[PDB]
RNA sequence: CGUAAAGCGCACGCAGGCGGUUUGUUAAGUCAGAUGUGAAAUCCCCGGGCUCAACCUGGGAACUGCAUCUGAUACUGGCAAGCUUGAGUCUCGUAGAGGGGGGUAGAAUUCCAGGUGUAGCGGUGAAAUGCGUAGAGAUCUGGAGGAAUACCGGUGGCGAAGGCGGCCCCCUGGACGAAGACUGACGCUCAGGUGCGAAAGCGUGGGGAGCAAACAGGAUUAGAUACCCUGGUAGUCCACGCCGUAAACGAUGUCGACUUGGAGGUUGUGCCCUUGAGGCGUGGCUUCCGGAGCUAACGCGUUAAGUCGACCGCCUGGGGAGUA
């Protein structure tokens, strides 16, 4: 699980208004940080299929959130992917 | 998920008249209020009421002429998977006129007989009998 | 009134949702019978029993519960009432044509029961004779004075006499019945609530149904 | 489409299908009217002519269709602005054999060495093969190795399914709850596609204590290529790859809503008399009985096989055959 201090840091970084933990950029950034940490986990632990199912659930949730943000506001989507570093 | 709130409305009405509920409480909409107006005008229900401004809640007070219910049958005709649009000479009669067919026409939602008097067609919301 | 509503409900589990319009629910989950719903159906029931007694029809009240049937069999018989008290034989109203053979047997065994044919062959015929007389009297009772096809039918407990209300529904006879929480009120033409097991409740209800039915109209 | 044929073994998802609620609009669908057309002949409805009828023929109707012109949003579809009630995120906690890696512990089986001790042990319905007269079995001591974790243990718990049971640590997935905040339809299902997927089996390298296909011996039997016994190899165990099937079942696909009840289990929480594993509510997950209803019946029955809605998969008599 992502730590409370780490989630607070990402919420404060990606929220242009205070207490914006539910916004699409904050959710996508939280999911991206957990995905990078789990890639570091699964490199040491292959064959963890039960945790990889939760990883794929988080990947699908992040992709659907990014699709919604791309449909809603393309400038916010481009700014988020250019400060996160994904979808080349 | 929920795709047909109108079918959920008629489903709740049918389950209430089967379970002898006096009133059915559910979320509402403009189409739900229109169908409740048609049912109240034709006498299949007693009353309908909207409560609340944040979450509009519809209450229908079901009526019973006997121990049995008033509505003998209620079915959804136009579905999200299949919408039925019929013209003024093609919209049907339920029970050879003893029932009604709630139809959404170009000027409003009303009885099939009222739509035939108005000379308009549309999609049949439901069959009431 | 102060006479009704004192009787409280028992058997707090396995009640009926059809009964649930008649329970208070107070006294920590004990199903108390509501007085204001008990009384008006009771008043209308006695109005319609006054209507039946105006026709001079048969009332046919039945009670077969333990420690109450001995009160039922004697207390509610003023002059012309008709009772069933114990060992309620199934299907009496539906095949009363062939129960008429048994009641003619009861009439013939009651005729010359204290003299003559049953006194000859003093003991060996007579012990089987007395056992047959007492079992047939226990089985029928007031049916011999009833004479078949009653106008109304009164029931002291719908759950215990669910068979009786079923064949009364089959024959179209109106049913006046006191029910409990566990009993079904759907098949009863005139449902009144109360406690079936209570000796006080059964005695006061029997006195109430014996009241103003003795005379009918005239 | 539980049992007659039929729900993919399970899940994630592209296209596609459908989509909560409020306010503005050309109207694309849709609706209404009109026009152009939809050849004539042939079905249809009123008439005539053949002596009647078939047959011919006058007019109308019909050709349910396709284009063009005019209208508001009643609904669906697009655009614009919203809302939270669907979905999700954060704070604080709770239970759990959920998964991956490592370490360790205790019974017990087997083997080796040794001490005591003698003529049987083992096995079966009976025996016999087998072990033991080179000392078995039995008892005790020390050592070695592998596998599974007695009790707790449960009509318990977790996981999408397969499945997961000693203890401890590390990494990690999911679920649930009081309360508050946030985003604002971001949702449901998903043919192809991808991933997971018991046991048996296959490849390479290890390990191998019990168990044990194959194999051998002895029984049984008329025969016994078996059931039984005595052994016993692959395998069962570990690492990395395949295989992708099961009576993979709840023979019941997933999501959402509504619909009488009772008895328990498990797991959170609010109040009461802080005095108790005592009382009253609200959630989740579950076990059994049962009302209406449904069903051919058995039965299912708020976790439906009841009442509907969205989407996908499958069936069209048995055998041949899930075969070529």
């Amino acid at each position: 699980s992502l730590s409370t201090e780490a989630t607070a840091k990402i919420v404060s970084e990606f929220g242009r208004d205070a207490n914006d933990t539910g916004s699409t950029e904050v959710q996508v950034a939280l999911l991206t940080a957990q995905i990078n940490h789990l890639q570091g986990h699964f490199a040491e632990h292959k064959k963890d299929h039960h945790s990889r199912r939760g990883l794929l659930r988080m990947v699908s949730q992040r992709r659907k959130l990014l699709d919604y943000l791309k449909r809603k506001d393309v400038a916010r989507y481009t700014q988020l992917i250019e400060r996160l570093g994904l979808r080349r | 998920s929920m795709q047909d709130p109108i079918a959920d409305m008629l489903t709740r009405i049918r389950n209430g008249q089967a379970a002898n509920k006096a009133a059915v409480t559910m979320p509402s909409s403009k189409l739900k209020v229109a169908i409740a107006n048609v049912l109240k005008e034709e006498g299949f229900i007693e009353d309908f009421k909207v409560e609340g401004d944040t979450k509009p809640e519809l209450e229908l007070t079901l009526k019973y002429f006997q121990g049995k219910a008033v509505v003998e049958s209620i079915q959804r005709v136009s579905r999200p998977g299949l919408r039925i649009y019929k013209r003024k000479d093609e919209l049907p009669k339920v029970m050879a006129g003893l029932g009604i067919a709630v139809v959404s026409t170009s000027k409003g939602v009303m009885t099939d007989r009222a739509a035939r008097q108005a000379g308009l067609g549309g999609e049949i919301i439901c069959y009431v009998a | 009134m102060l006479k009704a509503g004192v009787h409280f409900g028992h058997q707090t589990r396995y009640w009926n949702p059809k009964m649930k319009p008649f329970i208070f629910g107070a006294r920590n989950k004990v199903h108390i019978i509501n007085l204001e719903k008990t009384v008006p159906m009771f008043n209308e029931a006695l109005a319609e029993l006054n209507k039946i007694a105006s026709r001079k029809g048969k009332i046919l009240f039945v009670g077969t519960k333990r420690a109450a049937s001995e009160a039922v069999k004697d207390a509610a018989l003023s002059c012309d009432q008709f009772f069933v008290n114990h060992r309620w034989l199934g299907g009496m109203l539906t095949n009363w044509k062939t129960v008429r053979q048994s009641i003619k047997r009861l009439k013939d065994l009651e005729t010359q029961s204290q003299d003559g044919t049953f006194d000859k062959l003093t003991k060996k015929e007579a012990l089987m004779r007395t056992r047959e007389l007492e079992k047939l009297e226990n089985s029928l009772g007031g049916i011999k004075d009833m004479g078949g096809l009653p106008d109304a039918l009164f029931v002291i407990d719908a759950d215990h006499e669910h068979i009786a209300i079923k064949e009364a529904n089959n024959l179209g006879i109106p049913v006046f019945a006191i029910v409990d929480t566990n009993s079904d009120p759907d098949g009863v033409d005139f449902v009144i609530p109360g406690n079936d097991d209570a000796i006080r409740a059964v005695t006061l209800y029997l006195g109430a149904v014996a009241a103003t039915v003795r005379e009918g109209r005239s």
Side-chain angles (χ1 to χ4, degrees), chain C residues 2 6 16-17 26 32 38 73 131 135 149 152 155 167 177 189 197 207 209 211 217:
Chain C
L2 189 151
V6 169
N16 264 316
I32 303 172
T38 308
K73 70 194 187 199
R131 183 146 268 153
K135 70 177 74 174
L149 280 81
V155 170
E167 42 185 288
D189 270 22
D197 313 292
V209 66
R217 203 166 299 169

Side-chain angles (χ1 to χ4, degrees), chain C residues 146-168:
Chain C
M146 193 257 299
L149 280 81
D151 273 336
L153 192 149
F154 188 83
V155 170
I156 201 66
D157 187 34
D159 203 0
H160 205 175
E161 297 294 327
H162 68 89
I163 171 169
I165 62 170
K166 264 206 73 163
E167 42 185 288

Side-chain angles (χ1 to χ4, degrees), chain C residues 1-193:
Chain C
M1 61 196 48
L2 189 151
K3 273 82 174 174
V6 169
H7 43 85
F8 296 145
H10 208 50
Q11 192 60 252
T12 60
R13 315 179 306 177
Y14 318 98
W15 37 259
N16 264 316
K18 333 201 171 82
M19 271 324 297
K20 293 302 278 307
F22 304 125
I23 296 89
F24 264 118
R27 277 281 318 174
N28 205 0
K29 196 177 183 292
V30 188
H31 293 281
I32 303 172
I33 298 168
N34 184 267
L35 194 150
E36 283 83 7
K37 290 302 282 191
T38 308
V39 67
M41 301 155 158
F42 184 76
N43 291 320
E44 184 178 1
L46 276 296
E48 302 296 281
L49 291 153
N50 278 282
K51 173 253 176 187
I52 301 299
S54 298
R55 304 294 183 274
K56 304 299 178 185
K58 275 82 74 175
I59 290 317
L60 196 80
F61 57 96
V62 62
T64 52
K65 300 181 70 68
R66 186 75 267 173
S69 85
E70 57 94 18
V72 173
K73 70 194 187 199
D74 59 359
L77 302 189
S78 75
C79 61
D80 55 359
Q81 288 82 20
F82 309 112
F83 73 104
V84 185
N85 51 346
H86 189 237
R87 316 203 195 131
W88 197 92
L89 302 188
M92 212 183 296
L93 305 149
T94 54
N95 66 10
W96 204 82
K97 319 195 189 174
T98 191
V99 176
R100 166 190 77 220
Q101 292 303 109
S102 300
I103 195 167
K104 190 256 180 180
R105 182 76 268 172
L106 165 73
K107 192 177 74 187
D108 276 23
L109 294 174
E110 205 80 10
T111 300
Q112 299 178 0
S113 65
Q114 64 272 15
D115 59 356
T117 68
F118 295 148
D119 279 335
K120 196 152 62 83
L121 282 197
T122 304
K123 178 179 72 142
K124 185 48 71 175
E125 205 273 332
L127 75 163
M128 171 195 88
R129 189 264 300 165
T130 54
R131 183 146 268 153
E132 188 72 32
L133 267 49
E134 78 193 3
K135 70 177 74 174
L136 215 59
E137 191 265 335
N138 272 329
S139 310
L140 297 194
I143 310 299
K144 176 198 51 205
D145 267 22
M146 193 257 299
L149 280 81
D151 273 336
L153 192 149
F154 188 83
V155 170
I156 201 66
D157 187 34
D159 203 0
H160 205 175
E161 297 294 327
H162 68 89
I163 171 169
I165 62 170
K166 264 206 73 163
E167 42 185 288
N169 278 9
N170 291 326
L171 262 68
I173 302 175
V175 183
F176 292 77
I178 189 167
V179 306
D180 213 351
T181 79
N182 42 66
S183 52
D184 273 318
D186 43 359
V188 177
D189 270 22
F190 278 107
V191 61
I192 57 178

Side-chain angles (χ1 to χ4, degrees), chain B residues 53-128:
Chain B
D53 67 323
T54 58
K55 297 179 179 67
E57 200 83 22
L58 199 52
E59 299 96 304
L60 280 72
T61 304
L62 317 166
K63 59 181 272 214
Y64 311 88
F65 179 62
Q66 297 285 316
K68 65 193 101 173
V70 164
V71 295
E72 281 192 352
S73 80
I74 185 66
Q75 59 167 336
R76 177 70 158 155
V77 182
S78 280
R79 292 184 291 112
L82 175 58
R83 308 247 181 202
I84 307 299
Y85 299 95
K86 301 291 270 294
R87 298 202 318 260
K88 58 172 272 183
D89 48 355
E90 295 186 339
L91 58 87
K93 311 176 151 293
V94 185
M95 301 205 47
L98 306 177
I100 64 160
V102 178
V103 54
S104 184
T105 58
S106 302
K107 298 290 178 67
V109 172
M110 51 205 178
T111 300
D112 62 358
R113 182 213 292 128
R116 218 185 282 102
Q117 293 280 354
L120 312 168
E123 62 174 308
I124 295 91
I125 301 299
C126 66
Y127 295 157
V128 187

